Amino acid sequence: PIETVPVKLKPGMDGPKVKQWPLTEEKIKALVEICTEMEKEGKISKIGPENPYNTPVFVDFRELNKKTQDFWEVQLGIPHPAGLKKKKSVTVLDVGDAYFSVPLDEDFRKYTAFTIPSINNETPGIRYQYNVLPQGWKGSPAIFQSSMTKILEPFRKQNPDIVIYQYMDDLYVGSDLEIGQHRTKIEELRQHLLRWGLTTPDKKHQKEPPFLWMGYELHPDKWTVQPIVLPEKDSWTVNDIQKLVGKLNWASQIYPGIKVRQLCKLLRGTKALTEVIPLTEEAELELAENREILKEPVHGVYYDPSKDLIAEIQKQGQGQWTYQIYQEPFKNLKTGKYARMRGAHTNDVKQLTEAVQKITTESIVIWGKTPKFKLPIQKETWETWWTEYWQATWVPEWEFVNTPPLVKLWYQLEKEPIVGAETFYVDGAASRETKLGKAGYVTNKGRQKVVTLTDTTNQKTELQAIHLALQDSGLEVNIVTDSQYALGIIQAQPDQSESELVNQIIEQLIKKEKVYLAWVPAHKGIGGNEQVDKLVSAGI
Amino acid sequence: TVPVKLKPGMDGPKVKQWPLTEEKIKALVEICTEMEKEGKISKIGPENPYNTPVFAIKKKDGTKWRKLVDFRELNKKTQDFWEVQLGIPHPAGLKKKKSVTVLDVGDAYFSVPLDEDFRKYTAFTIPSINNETPGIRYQYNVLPQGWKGSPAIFQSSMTKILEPFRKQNPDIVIYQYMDDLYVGSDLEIGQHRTKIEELRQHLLRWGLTGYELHPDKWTVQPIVLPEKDSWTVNDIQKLVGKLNWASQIYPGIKVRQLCKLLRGTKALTEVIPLTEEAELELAENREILKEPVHGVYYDPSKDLIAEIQKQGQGQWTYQIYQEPFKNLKTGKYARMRGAHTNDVKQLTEAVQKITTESIVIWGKTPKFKLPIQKETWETWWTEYWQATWVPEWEFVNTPPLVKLWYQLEK
RNA sequence: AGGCCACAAUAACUAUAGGCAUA
DNA sequence: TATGCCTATAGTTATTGTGGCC
Ligand SMILES: O=C1Nc2ccc(Cl)cc2[C@@](C#CC2CC2)(C(F)(F)F)O1
Ligand SMILES: [Ca+2]
Ligand SMILES: [Ca+2]
């Protein structure tokens, strides 16, 4: 009475009518012996010229799976060992007769038909069809889990003190009871599964507490990954770097200090499978220190619902952040490596907030509650940025912690114009033909300077003009520009390699005492702005 | 019972479930178990590929958790049923009233059975913490809250029960949208509360079960320009930049005489006296901002758009339009007074208030343009959300010029 | 006669909204 | 109206890799 699940096909196609491959005879003699045993057990049944559908046997259901209907996800996101609870005794159960115990929908059974190769030149042959769930089928793990969940329900209600997790065929059972009480309850679970015809290993055949699951070596009190050993010195190829990044990203969940950006910069190149990309001194520098991190063995800690979650942020470099989540000090649950400056530039404060937002969402999936943050930023700086910024955000609980690399807001522009300060009207113009541009400034005192540039755009020339306006000016400066682009960048705090010019302007503004910056509409006949525009667009 | 079919070509809703907190999931399990025993929803297997997002909200009167299902995706695929086949009529006299009271009648749809073949499209999944359990699956057996077809089917039974109320009060206007009921009246403060209860007591006859609006008080506040005694170059330059951008909204605005005040290079502090032409241009520009602009009309064939800007210090401004620079309704939602308010809460309170105003005047939910990140909004919006509707939103960038213009609005 | 799940990197298609420049 | 050059918001399909599985 294992309750069959009704399964249909996709709207506009019948089952696979694919023919068999040439006979071998070396494999046929073995296949008959296996199929007869499956027929005797009741897994498959004989059919004649009735069934038009056919499936090739190596059984490859590649054509049928495309024709079979879509099933809802079995398990999309995999459980993280940090989200699991600490248990006294743990037991795993490898289920035999998994897909064999659960029967298939009778009407669908005709689509799973397969024909055995002949003995001597296309002789009639023997035909079979699956009465139960077949291996390598789309709906096989979906129905099996759905059937298993209904079986475990009465046991879960009777035993809420114990925790049972189901994965594919294997079952993970854990409790806080003594080793004597725990061992007895597993046998009671086995007898319940044996009712439906599910074979499970006995006490002596059961695996010991070091479980290997999804690459993780699990323990009742702690968890660790399998030792990561990588090929070393000699000049490696392009995909060997991709294999190295894959191992470092895999280690980033437990090892806190991992830097992978320089290897990602080498993979920014395209094409050849054997390019043999050499290393830069800065690339091997972060690679050599990552070897030191992977030397000493580390372990993760399980989640406790009583204690609060605490996350800490550190700025390790240019567009790189590292976080470690812990309930107890020095006892880390999970680490990360967030460095997602998406090829852009951004800043320091917003980029930190983008880091916080990723962990907040991560904690909802894993633990189910929001963690308390300890950020390397003062409340004075946080309030100043988010009041002047257009984008809204909210971090409910966060505290201040002084770390060696503090997040620092460099400069702030004046809200009102400065008295006695020299006024600088500024403008830049360029043409995309030949790529020539001019940048200049005109003051109220009379002084002016115009320069010419090579390989430049309108965005670069306007940015060069303000650089000249800060180069020749005093301490208190009033700068007027007609660009929304040039105003928008300086009003933000670009903490990146936004190319040469931007880093020079930021460095200039730190040296100055007070700077006021204003915007005017272009080509409107405004005094000051009109005089500069005629000079920069003289030959353009 | 009534047969329901999808729009030809399109399949059912297949949307990913957004992760929920440990407290919210346990609250949803308690509600879903109650509804399963009542015969509202039933468990279904993995053979159903269709999915609908589910969120947990909180109420004020009930004080307990409420189940919210996001049918936004499915409603786009079943739009021919509740708009063309069974459309709800909308009057143009609801927007003019003294007092409007809103009531929730969402429990009324929990009795009328749903079509057998259409039951599979209302499937939703309850997520698990760290994916320990496979995830609990359910589908609606009756008319669900948040689905546009529910008021369309009940419409034939809704008009017959409101007939004794409509015949009693001919001058009083009533309108139904989704799970909320809108009643407008020109009666007094003490009269309004009693007449609503008369309809509320009538609901109990059929068996089913500080919030008061003033649509006449939604008068559009005009944009006022700074009244200054002495003008400087910097004061003109900020004004010209804002007015030149506003020329595409209000065509009557000109900056020609104000620009002639700036002759040659001048300091920002330099005091410029206003001439006969400059004063007369600025004064007429103030008159254009006070009087409503021509060429602004509602179009039923086009979708409505709503854009909100953050001004800071607990101030938010908004615009309702169908085409850019042509606003049908403007204003500013400052803050819900004092207590506990953040950037998300003030925005959440604004969106709900703008949506409610959109239903009274037009009867359609606008496309929301929000100055917030997608990941930030989708996590915290459920905390302060109360209404059953779900407006279609997008996340965009806020220009500096549009932010500085609408803060001059009174 | 490799596919599926999680994460990451590279590439490509970007789409929408606003803006500047030239035509 | 087109293309090149800027900002912001949001995605999609392919490859490769790491950890796993059928
Ligand atoms: O809540 C947890 N605690 C736990 C702790 C250690 C181990 Cl090794 C296993 C668990 C467990 C889980 C497991 C599935 C991930 C494999 C257990 F399956 F129930 F065992 O449940
Ligand atoms: Ca454009
Ligand atoms: Ca792969």
PDB file of N, CA and C in Angstrom, chain B residues 328-407:
ATOM      1  N   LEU B 328      -0.315  63.862 -12.419  1.00  0.00           N
ATOM      2  CA  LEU B 328      -1.743  63.942 -12.116  1.00  0.00           C
ATOM      3  C   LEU B 328      -1.968  64.316 -10.653  1.00  0.00           C
ATOM      4  N   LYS B 329      -1.101  63.807  -9.778  1.00  0.00           N
ATOM      5  CA  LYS B 329      -1.201  64.048  -8.342  1.00  0.00           C
ATOM      6  C   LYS B 329       0.185  64.103  -7.703  1.00  0.00           C
ATOM      7  N   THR B 330       0.449  65.182  -6.969  1.00  0.00           N
ATOM      8  CA  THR B 330       1.720  65.365  -6.264  1.00  0.00           C
ATOM      9  C   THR B 330       1.514  65.692  -4.786  1.00  0.00           C
ATOM     10  N   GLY B 331       2.605  65.652  -4.026  1.00  0.00           N
ATOM     11  CA  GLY B 331       2.580  65.951  -2.596  1.00  0.00           C
ATOM     12  C   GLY B 331       3.804  65.409  -1.882  1.00  0.00           C
ATOM     13  N   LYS B 332       3.786  65.479  -0.555  1.00  0.00           N
ATOM     14  CA  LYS B 332       4.885  64.964   0.261  1.00  0.00           C
ATOM     15  C   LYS B 332       4.411  64.345   1.579  1.00  0.00           C
ATOM     16  N   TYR B 333       4.778  63.084   1.792  1.00  0.00           N
ATOM     17  CA  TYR B 333       4.532  62.403   3.060  1.00  0.00           C
ATOM     18  C   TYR B 333       5.749  62.552   3.964  1.00  0.00           C
ATOM     19  N   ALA B 334       5.627  63.416   4.968  1.00  0.00           N
ATOM     20  CA  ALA B 334       6.731  63.714   5.879  1.00  0.00           C
ATOM     21  C   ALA B 334       7.114  62.507   6.737  1.00  0.00           C
ATOM     22  N   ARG B 335       6.356  62.272   7.808  1.00  0.00           N
ATOM     23  CA  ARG B 335       6.660  61.209   8.764  1.00  0.00           C
ATOM     24  C   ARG B 335       5.448  60.861   9.622  1.00  0.00           C
ATOM     25  N   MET B 336       5.342  59.588   9.997  1.00  0.00           N
ATOM     26  CA  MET B 336       4.425  59.172  11.050  1.00  0.00           C
ATOM     27  C   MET B 336       5.065  59.581  12.376  1.00  0.00           C
ATOM     28  N   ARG B 337       4.377  60.460  13.100  1.00  0.00           N
ATOM     29  CA  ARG B 337       4.962  61.265  14.182  1.00  0.00           C
ATOM     30  C   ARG B 337       5.729  60.534  15.292  1.00  0.00           C
ATOM     31  N   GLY B 338       6.958  60.995  15.529  1.00  0.00           N
ATOM     32  CA  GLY B 338       7.743  60.642  16.715  1.00  0.00           C
ATOM     33  C   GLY B 338       8.265  59.222  16.830  1.00  0.00           C
ATOM     34  N   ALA B 339       7.708  58.499  17.804  1.00  0.00           N
ATOM     35  CA  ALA B 339       8.100  57.132  18.211  1.00  0.00           C
ATOM     36  C   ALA B 339       9.345  56.508  17.556  1.00  0.00           C
ATOM     37  N   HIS B 340       9.090  55.401  16.863  1.00  0.00           N
ATOM     38  CA  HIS B 340      10.063  54.526  16.227  1.00  0.00           C
ATOM     39  C   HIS B 340       9.887  54.528  14.718  1.00  0.00           C
ATOM     40  N   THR B 341      10.698  55.259  13.964  1.00  0.00           N
ATOM     41  CA  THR B 341      10.577  55.239  12.507  1.00  0.00           C
ATOM     42  C   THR B 341      11.943  55.192  11.830  1.00  0.00           C
ATOM     43  N   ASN B 342      12.044  54.370  10.789  1.00  0.00           N
ATOM     44  CA  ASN B 342      13.262  54.258   9.989  1.00  0.00           C
ATOM     45  C   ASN B 342      13.000  54.538   8.507  1.00  0.00           C
ATOM     46  N   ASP B 343      14.029  54.366   7.679  1.00  0.00           N
ATOM     47  CA  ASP B 343      13.934  54.626   6.241  1.00  0.00           C
ATOM     48  C   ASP B 343      12.996  53.662   5.514  1.00  0.00           C
ATOM     49  N   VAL B 344      12.902  52.434   6.020  1.00  0.00           N
ATOM     50  CA  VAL B 344      12.021  51.415   5.446  1.00  0.00           C
ATOM     51  C   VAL B 344      10.567  51.649   5.869  1.00  0.00           C
ATOM     52  N   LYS B 345      10.355  51.872   7.168  1.00  0.00           N
ATOM     53  CA  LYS B 345       9.017  52.071   7.733  1.00  0.00           C
ATOM     54  C   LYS B 345       8.298  53.280   7.130  1.00  0.00           C
ATOM     55  N   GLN B 346       9.014  54.397   7.008  1.00  0.00           N
ATOM     56  CA  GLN B 346       8.465  55.627   6.431  1.00  0.00           C
ATOM     57  C   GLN B 346       8.105  55.464   4.955  1.00  0.00           C
ATOM     58  N   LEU B 347       8.865  54.624   4.254  1.00  0.00           N
ATOM     59  CA  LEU B 347       8.597  54.305   2.853  1.00  0.00           C
ATOM     60  C   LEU B 347       7.422  53.333   2.726  1.00  0.00           C
ATOM     61  N   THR B 348       7.357  52.364   3.639  1.00  0.00           N
ATOM     62  CA  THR B 348       6.277  51.371   3.675  1.00  0.00           C
ATOM     63  C   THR B 348       4.930  52.027   3.992  1.00  0.00           C
ATOM     64  N   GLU B 349       4.948  52.995   4.907  1.00  0.00           N
ATOM     65  CA  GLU B 349       3.756  53.766   5.266  1.00  0.00           C
ATOM     66  C   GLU B 349       3.309  54.683   4.127  1.00  0.00           C
ATOM     67  N   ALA B 350       4.271  55.134   3.323  1.00  0.00           N
ATOM     68  CA  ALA B 350       3.995  55.996   2.176  1.00  0.00           C
ATOM     69  C   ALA B 350       3.373  55.221   1.016  1.00  0.00           C
ATOM     70  N   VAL B 351       3.976  54.081   0.673  1.00  0.00           N
ATOM     71  CA  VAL B 351       3.500  53.223  -0.422  1.00  0.00           C
ATOM     72  C   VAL B 351       2.037  52.812  -0.223  1.00  0.00           C
ATOM     73  N   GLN B 352       1.709  52.359   0.987  1.00  0.00           N
ATOM     74  CA  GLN B 352       0.344  51.956   1.336  1.00  0.00           C
ATOM     75  C   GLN B 352      -0.648  53.117   1.250  1.00  0.00           C
ATOM     76  N   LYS B 353      -0.194  54.310   1.634  1.00  0.00           N
ATOM     77  CA  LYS B 353      -1.021  55.516   1.592  1.00  0.00           C
ATOM     78  C   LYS B 353      -1.255  56.009   0.163  1.00  0.00           C
ATOM     79  N   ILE B 354      -0.235  55.878  -0.683  1.00  0.00           N
ATOM     80  CA  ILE B 354      -0.330  56.252  -2.099  1.00  0.00           C
ATOM     81  C   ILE B 354      -1.226  55.270  -2.861  1.00  0.00           C
ATOM     82  N   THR B 355      -1.101  53.983  -2.534  1.00  0.00           N
ATOM     83  CA  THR B 355      -1.910  52.927  -3.151  1.00  0.00           C
ATOM     84  C   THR B 355      -3.399  53.104  -2.837  1.00  0.00           C
ATOM     85  N   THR B 356      -3.705  53.435  -1.582  1.00  0.00           N
ATOM     86  CA  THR B 356      -5.086  53.650  -1.136  1.00  0.00           C
ATOM     87  C   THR B 356      -5.723  54.851  -1.843  1.00  0.00           C
ATOM     88  N   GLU B 357      -4.934  55.905  -2.049  1.00  0.00           N
ATOM     89  CA  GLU B 357      -5.380  57.093  -2.779  1.00  0.00           C
ATOM     90  C   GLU B 357      -5.633  56.796  -4.257  1.00  0.00           C
ATOM     91  N   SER B 358      -4.854  55.871  -4.813  1.00  0.00           N
ATOM     92  CA  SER B 358      -4.961  55.487  -6.221  1.00  0.00           C
ATOM     93  C   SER B 358      -6.234  54.696  -6.527  1.00  0.00           C
ATOM     94  N   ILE B 359      -6.707  53.935  -5.543  1.00  0.00           N
ATOM     95  CA  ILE B 359      -7.909  53.109  -5.693  1.00  0.00           C
ATOM     96  C   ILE B 359      -9.188  53.954  -5.624  1.00  0.00           C
ATOM     97  N   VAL B 360      -9.177  54.977  -4.772  1.00  0.00           N
ATOM     98  CA  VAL B 360     -10.331  55.867  -4.599  1.00  0.00           C
ATOM     99  C   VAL B 360     -10.579  56.720  -5.848  1.00  0.00           C
ATOM    100  N   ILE B 361      -9.511  57.301  -6.391  1.00  0.00           N
ATOM    101  CA  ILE B 361      -9.612  58.205  -7.540  1.00  0.00           C
ATOM    102  C   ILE B 361      -9.765  57.453  -8.867  1.00  0.00           C
ATOM    103  N   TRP B 362      -8.957  56.412  -9.066  1.00  0.00           N
ATOM    104  CA  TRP B 362      -8.922  55.699 -10.348  1.00  0.00           C
ATOM    105  C   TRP B 362      -9.359  54.262 -10.264  1.00  0.00           C
ATOM    106  N   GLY B 363      -8.873  53.546  -9.252  1.00  0.00           N
ATOM    107  CA  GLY B 363      -9.214  52.135  -9.070  1.00  0.00           C
ATOM    108  C   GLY B 363      -8.160  51.172  -9.585  1.00  0.00           C
ATOM    109  N   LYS B 364      -6.938  51.670  -9.762  1.00  0.00           N
ATOM    110  CA  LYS B 364      -5.814  50.849 -10.213  1.00  0.00           C
ATOM    111  C   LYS B 364      -4.560  51.096  -9.377  1.00  0.00           C
ATOM    112  N   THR B 365      -3.785  50.036  -9.163  1.00  0.00           N
ATOM    113  CA  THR B 365      -2.532  50.118  -8.414  1.00  0.00           C
ATOM    114  C   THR B 365      -1.385  50.570  -9.322  1.00  0.00           C
ATOM    115  N   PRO B 366      -0.623  51.594  -8.887  1.00  0.00           N
ATOM    116  CA  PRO B 366       0.460  52.143  -9.704  1.00  0.00           C
ATOM    117  C   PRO B 366       1.775  51.368  -9.597  1.00  0.00           C
ATOM    118  N   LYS B 367       2.620  51.505 -10.617  1.00  0.00           N
ATOM    119  CA  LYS B 367       3.975  50.959 -10.602  1.00  0.00           C
ATOM    120  C   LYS B 367       4.874  51.830  -9.730  1.00  0.00           C
ATOM    121  N   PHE B 368       5.403  51.241  -8.661  1.00  0.00           N
ATOM    122  CA  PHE B 368       6.204  51.984  -7.689  1.00  0.00           C
ATOM    123  C   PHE B 368       7.695  52.016  -8.017  1.00  0.00           C
ATOM    124  N   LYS B 369       8.232  53.227  -8.133  1.00  0.00           N
ATOM    125  CA  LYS B 369       9.663  53.443  -8.310  1.00  0.00           C
ATOM    126  C   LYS B 369      10.280  53.801  -6.961  1.00  0.00           C
ATOM    127  N   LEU B 370      11.085  52.887  -6.426  1.00  0.00           N
ATOM    128  CA  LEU B 370      11.627  53.025  -5.075  1.00  0.00           C
ATOM    129  C   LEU B 370      13.129  53.320  -5.066  1.00  0.00           C
ATOM    130  N   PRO B 371      13.563  54.264  -4.205  1.00  0.00           N
ATOM    131  CA  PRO B 371      14.984  54.563  -4.035  1.00  0.00           C
ATOM    132  C   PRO B 371      15.634  53.659  -2.981  1.00  0.00           C
ATOM    133  N   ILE B 372      15.569  52.351  -3.216  1.00  0.00           N
ATOM    134  CA  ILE B 372      16.100  51.346  -2.295  1.00  0.00           C
ATOM    135  C   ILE B 372      16.586  50.121  -3.081  1.00  0.00           C
ATOM    136  N   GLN B 373      17.536  49.383  -2.509  1.00  0.00           N
ATOM    137  CA  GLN B 373      18.031  48.148  -3.118  1.00  0.00           C
ATOM    138  C   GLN B 373      17.001  47.025  -3.007  1.00  0.00           C
ATOM    139  N   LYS B 374      17.052  46.089  -3.952  1.00  0.00           N
ATOM    140  CA  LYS B 374      16.103  44.974  -4.023  1.00  0.00           C
ATOM    141  C   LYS B 374      16.211  44.035  -2.820  1.00  0.00           C
ATOM    142  N   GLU B 375      17.444  43.704  -2.437  1.00  0.00           N
ATOM    143  CA  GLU B 375      17.706  42.793  -1.323  1.00  0.00           C
ATOM    144  C   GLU B 375      17.329  43.412   0.027  1.00  0.00           C
ATOM    145  N   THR B 376      17.504  44.727   0.140  1.00  0.00           N
ATOM    146  CA  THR B 376      17.185  45.467   1.362  1.00  0.00           C
ATOM    147  C   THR B 376      15.673  45.567   1.580  1.00  0.00           C
ATOM    148  N   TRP B 377      14.937  45.796   0.494  1.00  0.00           N
ATOM    149  CA  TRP B 377      13.485  45.969   0.547  1.00  0.00           C
ATOM    150  C   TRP B 377      12.746  44.680   0.783  1.00  0.00           C
ATOM    151  N   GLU B 378      13.141  43.626   0.069  1.00  0.00           N
ATOM    152  CA  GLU B 378      12.452  42.329   0.124  1.00  0.00           C
ATOM    153  C   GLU B 378      12.567  41.606   1.473  1.00  0.00           C
ATOM    154  N   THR B 379      13.466  42.084   2.330  1.00  0.00           N
ATOM    155  CA  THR B 379      13.703  41.467   3.636  1.00  0.00           C
ATOM    156  C   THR B 379      12.885  42.129   4.750  1.00  0.00           C
ATOM    157  N   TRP B 380      12.722  43.449   4.669  1.00  0.00           N
ATOM    158  CA  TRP B 380      12.147  44.229   5.770  1.00  0.00           C
ATOM    159  C   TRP B 380      10.775  44.808   5.525  1.00  0.00           C
ATOM    160  N   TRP B 381      10.238  44.622   4.319  1.00  0.00           N
ATOM    161  CA  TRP B 381       8.941  45.209   3.959  1.00  0.00           C
ATOM    162  C   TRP B 381       7.766  44.533   4.618  1.00  0.00           C
ATOM    163  N   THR B 382       7.929  43.257   4.962  1.00  0.00           N
ATOM    164  CA  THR B 382       6.859  42.454   5.564  1.00  0.00           C
ATOM    165  C   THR B 382       6.571  42.822   7.022  1.00  0.00           C
ATOM    166  N   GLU B 383       7.537  43.470   7.671  1.00  0.00           N
ATOM    167  CA  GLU B 383       7.439  43.833   9.087  1.00  0.00           C
ATOM    168  C   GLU B 383       6.375  44.896   9.364  1.00  0.00           C
ATOM    169  N   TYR B 384       6.277  45.882   8.475  1.00  0.00           N
ATOM    170  CA  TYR B 384       5.369  47.016   8.663  1.00  0.00           C
ATOM    171  C   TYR B 384       4.191  47.001   7.682  1.00  0.00           C
ATOM    172  N   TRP B 385       4.069  45.911   6.926  1.00  0.00           N
ATOM    173  CA  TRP B 385       3.012  45.754   5.929  1.00  0.00           C
ATOM    174  C   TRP B 385       1.745  45.237   6.554  1.00  0.00           C
ATOM    175  N   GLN B 386       0.610  45.791   6.131  1.00  0.00           N
ATOM    176  CA  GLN B 386      -0.696  45.409   6.675  1.00  0.00           C
ATOM    177  C   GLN B 386      -1.717  45.035   5.599  1.00  0.00           C
ATOM    178  N   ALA B 387      -1.753  45.815   4.520  1.00  0.00           N
ATOM    179  CA  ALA B 387      -2.730  45.633   3.443  1.00  0.00           C
ATOM    180  C   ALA B 387      -2.518  44.337   2.664  1.00  0.00           C
ATOM    181  N   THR B 388      -3.617  43.753   2.193  1.00  0.00           N
ATOM    182  CA  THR B 388      -3.576  42.500   1.433  1.00  0.00           C
ATOM    183  C   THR B 388      -3.144  42.702  -0.025  1.00  0.00           C
ATOM    184  N   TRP B 389      -3.279  43.892  -0.555  1.00  0.00           N
ATOM    185  CA  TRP B 389      -2.865  44.032  -1.918  1.00  0.00           C
ATOM    186  C   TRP B 389      -1.361  44.018  -1.987  1.00  0.00           C
ATOM    187  N   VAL B 390      -0.879  43.840  -3.190  1.00  0.00           N
ATOM    188  CA  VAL B 390       0.553  43.841  -3.484  1.00  0.00           C
ATOM    189  C   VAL B 390       0.830  44.631  -4.766  1.00  0.00           C
ATOM    190  N   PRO B 391       1.320  45.879  -4.623  1.00  0.00           N
ATOM    191  CA  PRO B 391       1.634  46.727  -5.772  1.00  0.00           C
ATOM    192  C   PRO B 391       2.903  46.277  -6.489  1.00  0.00           C
ATOM    193  N   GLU B 392       2.895  46.371  -7.816  1.00  0.00           N
ATOM    194  CA  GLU B 392       4.049  46.010  -8.633  1.00  0.00           C
ATOM    195  C   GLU B 392       5.104  47.108  -8.533  1.00  0.00           C
ATOM    196  N   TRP B 393       6.289  46.750  -8.041  1.00  0.00           N
ATOM    197  CA  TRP B 393       7.348  47.732  -7.799  1.00  0.00           C
ATOM    198  C   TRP B 393       8.626  47.473  -8.551  1.00  0.00           C
ATOM    199  N   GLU B 394       9.386  48.545  -8.768  1.00  0.00           N
ATOM    200  CA  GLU B 394      10.722  48.475  -9.357  1.00  0.00           C
ATOM    201  C   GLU B 394      11.690  49.369  -8.578  1.00  0.00           C
ATOM    202  N   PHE B 395      12.985  49.089  -8.705  1.00  0.00           N
ATOM    203  CA  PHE B 395      14.011  49.803  -7.948  1.00  0.00           C
ATOM    204  C   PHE B 395      14.944  50.579  -8.875  1.00  0.00           C
ATOM    205  N   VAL B 396      14.939  51.905  -8.735  1.00  0.00           N
ATOM    206  CA  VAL B 396      15.689  52.792  -9.633  1.00  0.00           C
ATOM    207  C   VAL B 396      16.530  53.847  -8.905  1.00  0.00           C
ATOM    208  N   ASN B 397      17.299  54.605  -9.686  1.00  0.00           N
ATOM    209  CA  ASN B 397      18.155  55.679  -9.185  1.00  0.00           C
ATOM    210  C   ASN B 397      17.435  57.028  -9.152  1.00  0.00           C
ATOM    211  N   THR B 398      17.718  57.819  -8.118  1.00  0.00           N
ATOM    212  CA  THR B 398      17.133  59.150  -7.966  1.00  0.00           C
ATOM    213  C   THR B 398      18.111  60.241  -8.426  1.00  0.00           C
ATOM    214  N   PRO B 399      17.728  61.005  -9.468  1.00  0.00           N
ATOM    215  CA  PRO B 399      18.500  62.158  -9.951  1.00  0.00           C
ATOM    216  C   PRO B 399      18.575  63.290  -8.918  1.00  0.00           C
ATOM    217  N   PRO B 400      19.654  64.100  -8.961  1.00  0.00           N
ATOM    218  CA  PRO B 400      19.823  65.214  -8.021  1.00  0.00           C
ATOM    219  C   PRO B 400      18.842  66.366  -8.250  1.00  0.00           C
ATOM    220  N   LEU B 401      18.460  66.591  -9.507  1.00  0.00           N
ATOM    221  CA  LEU B 401      17.586  67.710  -9.874  1.00  0.00           C
ATOM    222  C   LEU B 401      16.131  67.516  -9.445  1.00  0.00           C
ATOM    223  N   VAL B 402      15.645  66.278  -9.530  1.00  0.00           N
ATOM    224  CA  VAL B 402      14.272  65.943  -9.137  1.00  0.00           C
ATOM    225  C   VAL B 402      14.106  65.952  -7.610  1.00  0.00           C
ATOM    226  N   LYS B 403      15.208  65.720  -6.898  1.00  0.00           N
ATOM    227  CA  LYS B 403      15.219  65.717  -5.437  1.00  0.00           C
ATOM    228  C   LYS B 403      15.161  67.142  -4.884  1.00  0.00           C
ATOM    229  N   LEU B 404      15.873  68.058  -5.539  1.00  0.00           N
ATOM    230  CA  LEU B 404      15.960  69.450  -5.093  1.00  0.00           C
ATOM    231  C   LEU B 404      14.758  70.300  -5.511  1.00  0.00           C
ATOM    232  N   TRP B 405      13.977  69.803  -6.469  1.00  0.00           N
ATOM    233  CA  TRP B 405      12.813  70.532  -6.976  1.00  0.00           C
ATOM    234  C   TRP B 405      11.589  70.356  -6.118  1.00  0.00           C
ATOM    235  N   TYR B 406      11.302  69.113  -5.737  1.00  0.00           N
ATOM    236  CA  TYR B 406      10.071  68.786  -5.013  1.00  0.00           C
ATOM    237  C   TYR B 406      10.131  69.027  -3.499  1.00  0.00           C
ATOM    238  N   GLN B 407      11.263  69.536  -3.012  1.00  0.00           N
ATOM    239  CA  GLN B 407      11.382  69.933  -1.606  1.00  0.00           C
ATOM    240  C   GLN B 407      10.869  71.356  -1.378  1.00  0.00           C
TER     241      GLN B 407
END
